[PDB]
Design a binder for this molecule. Structure first.
Ligand SMILES: O=CCCCC[C@@H]1SC[C@@H]2NC(=O)N[C@@H]21
Lengths: 95, 526, 526, 526
């Protein structure tokens, strides 16, 4: 009744998967929504914070931004497509 | 204390990848082909034969099994494809006999029922082999045997392959006598005519049930299966009005066996694997030339996808470790490449560990073709491969083998082939089995001819070589097909990969009906 | 039906009595002395050695055990005082090795860890004896052995007492091989350098775990304990990143032993004794000349202070009866005075009863000095005392001995001394052990001298006699001290009397891991 | 059919060669030294003690044995040199006890007689160890034990090393009780005073004989060993007039044991070796640095010098093969150089063969110093040497070890050292035993010091190093001498090489009194 407190138990490194997949293919759609704008061509050099796509979900605008300064290998969606939640939007060239 | 958190096997496959899409499509077609062929075999002799069978008041053979086993219990049928295209112009669905393991009155039993709609229930050479295989399974696991007898005798045109030899029809009665001496109940239900030489099956049984009007036993009603057999002759222990009554009586007989199952192994609560089983379609595919990580297969069949690997970095072409399937402990040995000296040594060490602790063993055979390596000084492999052949043979823990890929040459023996008496042996629809792979054989043939041609001095032209090679490749493909092998009883059935976990769970559960014995090894040639 | 009301042992001591006050004060001082000495031994080599040990990323030996055993489980350490003042100028806390019984993954195991902070983990003669004692305990009770290996090899200056003989370092590998042949798991974790001749310990183990950077195994990283040992050489079964990872792996290995404990004895719900245990301080004291009723000790350790005495009025100097400790049935034999012919006969009868019913035996040794009786025609005692020595030796039920007082002469043998292989042997801080009591020895020496002096005619003066006597008394006191005896491994530890019930409960629980065998007796010389 | 002609081992040595002349001269001197020292030990306490002993009408201890055993039968005495210079100022010839194996009434028995002329028969620490070793030999071979009891009790000045521990005096009665329970007859003859605690030995025996006037048993004539002990007390089973009468009674007692020897092994007629045994003097010599072919030793002890070598060209540093000694089959393992991985594997394979066929094993230890090879990547040896240590330990066939040369480090363990319970262990007068050879130890010490000196920067001069080295070399020589080792009971005796065949024949014959058990091996780390 005073309040609520959360305490975290440290996770041993061994149990944590060593060398987890490191590369993330673009921010994942915040939710299932229509793609309203695409700002990136099949091969485009982008810097962190460069808007890649705009998505409207339940009437709420989200702008996807570039995670890395890597050039874009490919785009998985085009304008007007409906993208499901947590589906890769952009592929980045391996560096 | 069992609260420790542990790592789990498996990774999420790339469903979008073209390889996964192609592999899933190919494997799915094989599974669909397997399903529809079984549907046809399900019909037995055919509509005319089935209509005649029912017209006599008798149940269809598969309906008899449905009524015999406990309501809703799974039934593990064996060798569904026996006799598939085995004989040139005769169709013998399932070999004329249905065998499997089901639960009767809460007890796991082996059920052997003649299919009277197929050639009137006559015994073809494959029919004897299928029955003998079922009896071997029942004895090794101490499973009571129930014979639903409706037979027409031996097939005279092929008598030489049925009557005379040790593994011929005579062995059937020998097995019954031996199991009876070991207190493995033998129950016979005569639900149709018992022909000459089949009259022994009711007589050799511990307890016997005969149907009033349909049943006839004679070495027709007056001669045998008569009220004479039930009362005057005394061959019958129970008298049944119809097929339904006889099946009800059989359940009562099993309930009076005074048997209770006891487990020799430790048990832990069951858990489902962390990954879908149908993903095995994309992961494995149908192309044996491509390679996959066997750990992916393991991750999708073991409880919670938990696996403790043994000697992970030594002899990496072989994977060994401990897991649990439906709560049972299991030691898994699976191929992950070409066998090496280190791999054989690693396997031999692992098999000793499992035998010491009385842990059942599961083998996943996927041997590789020699296209990658012509010889690789295989003489080194011979010295070590034998150590594994010798440990696997002497192991007394229950052994189950699953062929998920190729099975060629001496690699088959080291991985507990049919010759090494695994309790069960199953194959996936994409497997191939042969003395050597087809291509290698062709090359071998080519060299001999080219050189001999050289002694003559006659020129073996490039065309000549190809012409020689093509028939050989064809023969090997035809004879390594999963269907050829299963048509003859080399395995206990072709199973859908999505059903692998269920089949293994049922098989290991049945194998645990017998106590695990101590293992005695021969000399290990160090 | 277990609802019968029964009588209970024990009486309330007179806390106000001067004797109780004095006895409590003396015993308390001994316990406090015992506690603080263990605290010093707890520190091992010292601050500089401990700081160096941690600087290499390794856990301290006792922290390793804490992480290995189940959370919060008690740990029964053995022979804490091995090597206490054993060597003239060298301090070897605990003998350089820590041994005890703890629960790993719910299984009772024997843990043997080298203390690298003590002389770099070198093996002193007492170190070998302590390890050999631990292995003997593990084999007799079928306890899996876990070796936390961090050693520097044998101590060359004392090689003759380490290498050659049967009970020398070589016996360690012999014990490992024998236990492995009996399916008593041998698990080795190399958490530090394995020196010449210690490389065998990882190799002789059934399963082996080695730390990535710290571990080295060679008959340094390149020569042994290398990725070479883990992969190229194959000596390593598991590869661990650090000490924490290795301990986690060890717990997984034990969980896969496929072992479940089974009890041969009947079990009843546990109950605490009806009297406080700390009252034993006042009751017993530290003066061995005074006598106390052993029943008082029994009343404060058995469940509910319930005791069924056998032959109470016959041979009253010995007390025998049935009780229960933590639910286990136990037959208790304790001294209550000088041994007589009736006492020996009564004991022999009782031991046969316990062996017939497979009941564990507990001995409470408190033998009396001969100050009260010079001879008492001890020739009669010889004829009967042997009957008890012979019954006790042949008994196959688990036997535990607790020395709560004196232990002199043949009385030690009859009460299951160290020579008679009790599963465990413990001593209270007030005990004394010798061939004879010190005073008697002096008298014996005096008589011989006085008489021989008489033959010479030289006068042995009263002063001369006293002078002769004093050194003898001193030697006997020094050598009978509980610390002298425990420094060498004659007992498994010195225990606080208030902890007697807990130690017995843990010890009997461990001893029940092995099935109780049938007892075969020799000829009873009637 | 046994008429096949076969090849024979051995070659004629070059008697004229200087090496042979020198080797013969050196070995002969050692044998002469051994003989004359035994002559002195033969006299026991001395003329005054012997004269006093006879003056009481008692036979001398060795005359008692001569009269006890069958006329003209050989007597295999054990540990003749126990206590040789063991104690600083006290001479204890033979440890005060005479033990050996002889034939009584046609039955092989172990005879344990106290030497009353040595310190009045008091039990020194070595005396207890010698007796315990004799009892261990009797139990392992099922030899009846005859105790010629004439003792003065424990040696009080060294009580702490006699009374308390498991392998101390108490164990003597434990062994008697265990052997009696196994139907291994225990016969005691009290031919002199039985002191306190020795009165148990007559009582713990199955059958007992006491001399009328001399014998006294009490925990003097009136108190014990009285007509009271013979009749009133009943401790005595037979009453003897004198020593001669008691020995005659003992022979009658053994004849009534209802025992007949049965052989588990095949037997062939005996044949003498084709070469003289005394040539071993020239072949072997006394210089351990020089090397000889162990086959030469074998050729001069086996029947007809016939030997079937196993894996002759593989791991040639080790020699293994089958032969026969006095008709018994034997598998011989002998060192012929430094142990390698191939040698260890070859030995492990051979030991499995002998255990499978129940063939006794004989080991000939001659390990080599590391002067030739500093390391040779000994890490490889560790992986394989253990396989041999583990096979040798688990072998259940009778094992006899003969040290004909050096015995250092882990090579001792692999060749069935004292720690591995060989039925008998003998050493030639030229042997040396240590943790490592002396020179190597010095080098090791030198390196540590030189480097530590370097950290200080203080110069370790060449002289400084030599000064450090000399004491170490001396210690190792003193402590590896055959006499040091035999003085303590590490071996069962020092034997003349010319007597090797006879000693082995007697030892193997005695070891065959017990049935050969099946061998159970542990896990072979492949
Ligand atoms: O369409 C769903 C409801 C909210 C958006 C509708 C917009 S609000 C501006 C405009 N005026 C209307 O009456 N409807 C649209």
């Amino acid at each position: 009744k005073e309040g609520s407190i959360e305490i975290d138990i440290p996770v041993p490194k061994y149990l944590s998967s060593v060398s987890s997949q490191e590369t993330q293919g673009g921010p994942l759609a915040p939710m299932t929504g229509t793609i309203e704008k695409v700002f990136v061509k099949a091969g485009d050099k982008v810097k962190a914070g460069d808007s890649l796509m705009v998505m409207i979900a339940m009437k709420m605008e989200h702008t996807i931004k570039s995670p890395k300064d890597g050039t874009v290998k490919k785009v998985f969606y085009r304008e007007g497509a409906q993208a499901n939640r947590h589906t890769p939007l952009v592929e980045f060239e391996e560096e | 204390y069992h609260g420790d958190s542990v790592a789990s096997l498996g990774t999420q496959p790339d469903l979008g990848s073209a390889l996964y899409q192609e592999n899933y499509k190919q494997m799915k077609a094989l599974v669909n082909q397997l399903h529809e062929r079984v549907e046809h075999i399900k019909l037995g002799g055919g509509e005319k034969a089935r209509a005649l069978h029912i017209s006599r008041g008798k149940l269809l053979p598969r309906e008899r099994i449905d009524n015999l086993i406990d309501p809703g219990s799974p039934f593990l049928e064996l060798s569904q494809f026996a006799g598939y295209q085995l004989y040139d112009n005769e169709e013998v669905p399932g070999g004329g006999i249905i065998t499997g393991i089901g639960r009767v009155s809460g007890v796991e039993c082996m059920i052997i029922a003649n299919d009277a709609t197929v050639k009137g229930g006559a015994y073809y050479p494959v029919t004897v082999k299928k029955q003998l295989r079922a009896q071997e399974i029942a004895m090794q696991n101490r499973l009571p045997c129930i014979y639903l007898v409706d037979s027409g005798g031996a097939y005279l045109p092929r008598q030489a392959d049925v009557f005379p030899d040790r593994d011929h029809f005579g062995r059937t009665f020998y097995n019954q006598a031996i199991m009876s001496s070991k207190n493995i109940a033998q129950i016979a239900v005569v639900m149709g005519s018992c022909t000459a030489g089949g009259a022994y099956v009711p007589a050799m049984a511990d307890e016997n049930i005969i149907v009033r009007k349909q049943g006839t036993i004679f070495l027709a009603e007056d001669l045998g299966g008569a009220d004479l057999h039930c009362r005057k002759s005394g061959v019958s222990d129970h008298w049944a009005l119809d097929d339904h009554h006889a099946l009800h009586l059989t359940r009562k007989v099993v309930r009076n066996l005074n048997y209770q199952k006891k487990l020799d192994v430790t048990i832990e609560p069951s858990e489902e694997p962390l990954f879908p089983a149908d993903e095995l379609y994309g992961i494995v595919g149908a192309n044996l030339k491509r390679s996959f990580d066997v750990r992916e297969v393991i991750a999708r069949i073991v409880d919670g996808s938990r696996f403790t690997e043994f000697k992970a970095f030594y002899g990496d072409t072989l994977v060994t470790g401990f897991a649990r399937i439906f709560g049972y402990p299991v030691g898994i040995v699976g191929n992950n490449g070409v066998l090496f000296s280190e791999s054989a040594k690693k396997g031999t060490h692992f098999v000793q560990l499992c035998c010491q602790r009385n842990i059942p063993l599961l083998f996943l055979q996927n041997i590789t073709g020699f296209m990658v390596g012509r010889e690789y000084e295989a003489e080194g492999i011979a010295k070590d491969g034998a150590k594994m052949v010798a440990a696997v043979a002497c192991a007394q823990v229950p052994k189950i083998t699953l062929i998920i890929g190729g099975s060629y040459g001496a690699g088959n023996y080291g991985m507990c082939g049919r010759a090494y008496s695994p309790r069960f042996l199953y194959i996936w629809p994409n497997a191939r089995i042969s003395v050597m792979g087809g291509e290698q054989a062709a090359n071998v043939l080519a060299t001999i001819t080219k050189d001999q041609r050289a002694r003559e001095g006659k020129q073996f032209s490039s065309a000549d070589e190809a012409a020689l090679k093509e028939p050989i490749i064809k023969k090997f493909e035809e004879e390594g097909n999963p269907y050829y092998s299963s048509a003859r009883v080399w395995d206990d059935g072709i199973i859908d990969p999505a059903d692998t976990r269920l089949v293994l769970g049922l098989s290991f559960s049945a194998a645990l009906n017998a106590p695990i014995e101590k293992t005695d090894f021969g000399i290990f040639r160090m």
